Amino acid sequence: SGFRKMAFPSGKVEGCMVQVTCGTTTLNGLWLDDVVYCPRHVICTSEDMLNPNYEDLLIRKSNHNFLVQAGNVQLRVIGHSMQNCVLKLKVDTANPKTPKYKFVRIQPGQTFSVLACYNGSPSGVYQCAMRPNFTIKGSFLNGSCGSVGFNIDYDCVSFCYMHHMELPTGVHAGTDLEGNFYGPFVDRQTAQAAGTDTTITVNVLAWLYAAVINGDRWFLNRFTTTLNDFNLVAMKYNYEPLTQDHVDILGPLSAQTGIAVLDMCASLKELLQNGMNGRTILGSALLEDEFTPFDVVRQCSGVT
Amino acid sequence: SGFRKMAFPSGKVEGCMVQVTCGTTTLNGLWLDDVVYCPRHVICTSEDMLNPNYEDLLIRKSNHNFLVQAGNVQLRVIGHSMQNCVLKLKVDTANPKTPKYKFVRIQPGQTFSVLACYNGSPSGVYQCAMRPNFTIKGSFLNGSCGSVGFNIDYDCVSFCYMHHMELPTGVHAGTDLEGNFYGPFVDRQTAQAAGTDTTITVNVLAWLYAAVINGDRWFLNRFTTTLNDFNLVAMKYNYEPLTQDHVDILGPLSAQTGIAVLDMCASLKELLQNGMNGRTILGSALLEDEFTPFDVVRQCSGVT
Ligand SMILES: CCNc1ccc(C#N)cn1
Numbered sequence A, B: 001s002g003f004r005k006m007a008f009p010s011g012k013v014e015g016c017m018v019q020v021t022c023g024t025t026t027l028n029g030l031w032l033d034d035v036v037y038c039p040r041h042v043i044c045t046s047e048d049m050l051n052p053n054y055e056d057l058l059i060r061k062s063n064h065n066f067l068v069q070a071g072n073v074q075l076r077v078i079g080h081s082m083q084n085c086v087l088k089l090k091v092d093t094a095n096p097k098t099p100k101y102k103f104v105r106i107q108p109g110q111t112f113s114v115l116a117c118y119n120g121s122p123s124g125v126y127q128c129a130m131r132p133n134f135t136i137k138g139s140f141l142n143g144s145c146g147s148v149g150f151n152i153d154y155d156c157v158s159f160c161y162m163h164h165m166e167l168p169t170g171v172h173a174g175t176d177l178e179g180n181f182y183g184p185f186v187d188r189q190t191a192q193a194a195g196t197d198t199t200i201t202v203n204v205l206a207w208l209y210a211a212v213i214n215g216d217r218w219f220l221n222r223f224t225t226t227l228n229d230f231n232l233v234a235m236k237y238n239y240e241p242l243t244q245d246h247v248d249i250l251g252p253l254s255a256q257t258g259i260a261v262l263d264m265c266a267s268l269k270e271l272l273q274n275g276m277n278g279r280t281i282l283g284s285a286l287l288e289d290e291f292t293p294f295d296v297v298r299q300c301s302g303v304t
């Protein structure tokens, strides 16, 4: 019993973190096979970040201008290329700790673990979700860029995020490992406001299922609803609209608790219209939306 | 910016997890140098757990009765001893991934990371605190016993917890790595009620400091208080009494924000007497107490 915000074990990713230094700027890189991936803004001065032309700045950068350190050993850079907003440094040594891996671009509402790193050294691991406005709410200080987000299926790491920047509102933006930003963000020291940070309804419902399984049952109500009726309430409270695809995904949790998805919706409707009233669910006074239905099943079944 | 419930990177501990099987019971063990540590209840049938005599049950157990598997390789057990509530299986192979380590017995209110494991395989990592009633609120399914709690200082793992059991209220009890339970709990299938789960006041204050640093400032009030006045309110709200030792520990956070510890107390006093009023602090609608002053400094300074 018990239900925790749980990250994936980090060791497989720890074995891939390196330090990348281009002149004055140090951040983190991800070393898989014989390529190191890092944010392309490692080539910039603070002055360059105002309106950078990355292809222009890169003309002045040679293989020997990219210092890569793995632990306290130097790697030899034998090629480099830009791909969207990331650099790919080819090194002459395959990472001998390279796990099975994939690069995946996640959808908003999907969760992942972040291995926060500084100078190529792991500091901590936490669980994030891709918000509906394509920001994440992380914990990143100066030097954390190039820290990565990932999911693990048994022994395969699916890397889904690389950290690039902090908006003036202190939320976070980054790229997939092809270097494409999530959302509309750009790697420049310019005005970038995030859109509405709506609540990930399907994840809230998953977590309510997680709750009931753990006996935290007080919020269960005598009502049902319909998708359309629920969505009128969702829209009012800045929740994502629930679709039948979300209902289908919650099916296994419905099947476990014998609480029909629309019943759990009608109960969420009451939590939204009446608040917790100083009560808590799984140790939270707000409705938690950074567990996916898959996360709830995984944690409640003890997948390794 | 941003402030997350962060676990230590888990790889150093991942490299120490093994599966221990004694007849029908499988759980996890911790392999350091040439000893595997596990809960002594691995020797018991479900029937044995009603009123077990561990020294009596152990007479019937020889070295070859303890199956230890590290990945998919068997370890040869060349000795075993009981120490309090843990078994120590001597194996003929030093764990080649043994990190620098210590065994520490933590105090209530101290936080640690848990590497939840099943069949010797890591499933997830999360941050816990030793509660004032010597329980932890974990996420542990059947098979998770022998999962460990730890802190890391640079490259030294301080192991502080091994998971043994779940109370009927679904909170968790375990031992240090000398096999001594935290709190009054015993490894038996018997009535064990936890005491008052009071709030760890010094940790709440640390987290309020973490908040102000991140600009989440609305709760800052025009008041100060005294330790004695604050403690009258603490006692009412089932908070731990604040001592000068706690004030001393919060000194560095006081020094950063220019908010005197007693000012932050007077502000906590108002959050306690008036609630959040539907407002949030660092994404929480309750006052978070599983960050220590050390955690806040560590996370806010990016220690690796
Ligand atoms: C002056 C530093 N400002 C920065 C740094 C990195 C990024 C990105 N991506 C944007 N602005």
Ligand SMILES: CCNc1ccc(C#N)cn1
Residues within 6 Å of the ligand: B041, B046, B047, B049, B164, B165, B186, B187, B188, B189, B190
């Ligand atoms: C029937 C299983 N019940 C158990 C198992 C482990 C412990 C401990 N420690 C207590 N009860």
